Amino acid sequence: MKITVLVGGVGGARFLLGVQNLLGLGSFADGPSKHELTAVVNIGDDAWMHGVRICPDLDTCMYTLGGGIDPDRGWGHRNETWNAKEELAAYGVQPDWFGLGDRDLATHLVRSQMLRAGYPLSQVTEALCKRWQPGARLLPASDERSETHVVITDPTDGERRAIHFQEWWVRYRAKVPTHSFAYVGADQATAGPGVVEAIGDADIVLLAPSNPVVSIGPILQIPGIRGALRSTSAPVIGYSPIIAGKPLRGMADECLKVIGVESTSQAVGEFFGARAGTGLLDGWLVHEGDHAQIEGVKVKAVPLLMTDPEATAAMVRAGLDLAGVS
Amino acid sequence: MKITVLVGGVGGARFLLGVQNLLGLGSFADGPSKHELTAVVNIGDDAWMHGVRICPDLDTCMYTLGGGIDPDRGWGHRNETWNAKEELAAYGVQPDWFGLGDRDLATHLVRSQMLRAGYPLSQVTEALCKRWQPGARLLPASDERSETHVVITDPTDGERRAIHFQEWWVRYRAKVPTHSFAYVGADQATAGPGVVEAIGDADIVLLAPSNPVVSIGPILQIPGIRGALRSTSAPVIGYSPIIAGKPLRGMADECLKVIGVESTSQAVGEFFGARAGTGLLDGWLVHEGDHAQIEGVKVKAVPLLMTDPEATAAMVRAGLDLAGVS
């Protein structure tokens, strides 16, 4: 009755909604349910901005599962203003690095106050979730700092520099040469409380169809997490993030391009690799029409579009079935 | 050429406007400036709230002189939203009695980030004033903490408790039994950069008609400040904050009664005292019709209402005339 999903970004929050819908959790619950859902959440995008600690992936899961996301825009709070961001721009600090809405900042004020008072991020999340009540256990992949940076050629002096992923995404992406990722702090981090337990005891471990390099990937750089994934008796089912068939055939993933990986279901599959060898996957699900073949990994094409909680629920069901878990 | 004024918040900023209008400074500038205005600003109400440092008196002066104060509000940004505050409330956090505005939060966020990075308050203030361009030098009375505390009878248990001025002023509105004030940190606080020099090199020092107990008084408890005022070659001219029979906005009547001082123009003058003896004053201006007399103190009744910058400008000149300053 126990599911563990590794998540990051808007895509990860959407996948958890599918999981909740399938198992009657959170907003989809009718009576109190038979299953518990644990999310291991990326902290690679977390940063200190304007003296406050911002954790996007944990916040997006928490807001999404708590029913706080504006349905029209698809991100942020309902009835959101950006007045504090406006005054910051007048002050001269750069505030486009993250949405930084007024309602959003309240979360940041509360979290930063707890962190300064000695509460670890996992407990900070528990405290916020008492209000949001997402219907899932949102575990930060670590309580220690592990921030995704991008190494660029700085155009002001030609030097290699690491830039926080969020600054790279708004300002430098596609505008200067970019050489690699750095996981600043990862080597000094331990897996967050209950993360290795959640991976160890699960009936199944699901990799949401999030960005492989910068959403799932950074979770894997946290010491101990990869080991828990390679050892657990639970089947490990991955979902491909590559959806073909778009107008003009789509665009390659920019973060995959940094590490030189093609934007195909086959390449992302090899990226995570086979548990039978040195990799992470037992199963790899791809969208209708797509193909992959990887020595040791069971691949199945099924509809992989998170159109709505009901479509996402079907996708989760295809994961359980391919694992052989009920 | 050089004016130094000691100020509180709304009263202090309004008086500073009169000085600027008289001397063509700031928003009143109309050609090359011939005088420089320095404000020594109360830091007694400064507090850490929701993890950010609030400097009310410094901000009011800065907002007012910078044209960012909605006239109807009297303090705070114009077109101000309280969304973040509403969210803070949704989260169940304390203190819930103290409203932080969305536009106002940006000031606090920038100040807090800089103070935590090792910047002193004087440097933070100049940094903030580069945007606002107040047309005056806003000197925090100290860069060290010097916070006004209040001894009350707590109405929930009948026990004596000390509380920060913000709780006394904002939460209870001075309507709880109040026994004394404490200037916690004043003896340990060094006079802020340029504050002693501003008092020393001034042609005239003006005590603005701000709260005497909780606005001007707390400045005078900073050991260096009091010494400079009785030491400086400049005449020291004070303005009574009490208009006999004319209740003025604020709680100067409540704060005077705590220290056992009568609410009359003569009484506040006596509180500040005469430089000829143990005091600070050379001159004391009271409203037309009021009668006062302090041995060693030149007293003159003049129109003392800050209805608009021009009336205040007159009030400034009445100071200069009574001093004998051009």
Ligand SMILES: Nc1nc2c(ncn2[C@@H]2O[C@H](COP(=O)(O)OP(=O)(O)O)[C@@H](O)[C@H]2O)c(=O)[nH]1
């Ligand atoms: N398979 C699949 N992937 C999706 C779908 N919607 C979004 N994605 C993936 O979700 C990823 C979004 O990155 P994510 O880790 O969630 O961070 P985000 O940009 O904040 O959403 C993209 O790489 C997409 O390929 C979907 O319906 N199906």
Ligand SMILES: Nc1nc2c(ncn2[C@@H]2O[C@H](COP(=O)(O)OP(=O)(O)O)[C@@H](O)[C@H]2O)c(=O)[nH]1
């Ligand atoms: N003489 C005089 N005093 C005034 C006038 N308007 C307000 N005040 C005084 O200004 C004081 C507030 O100044 P201050 O302490 O700087 O304001 P706060 O910091 O916002 O409380 C009040 O206690 C009033 O007595 C006026 O027109 N004339």
Ligand SMILES: [Ca+2]
């Ligand atoms: Ca299509």
Ligand SMILES: [Ca+2]
């Ligand atoms: Ca004040």
Ligand SMILES: [Ca+2]
């Ligand atoms: Ca000190």
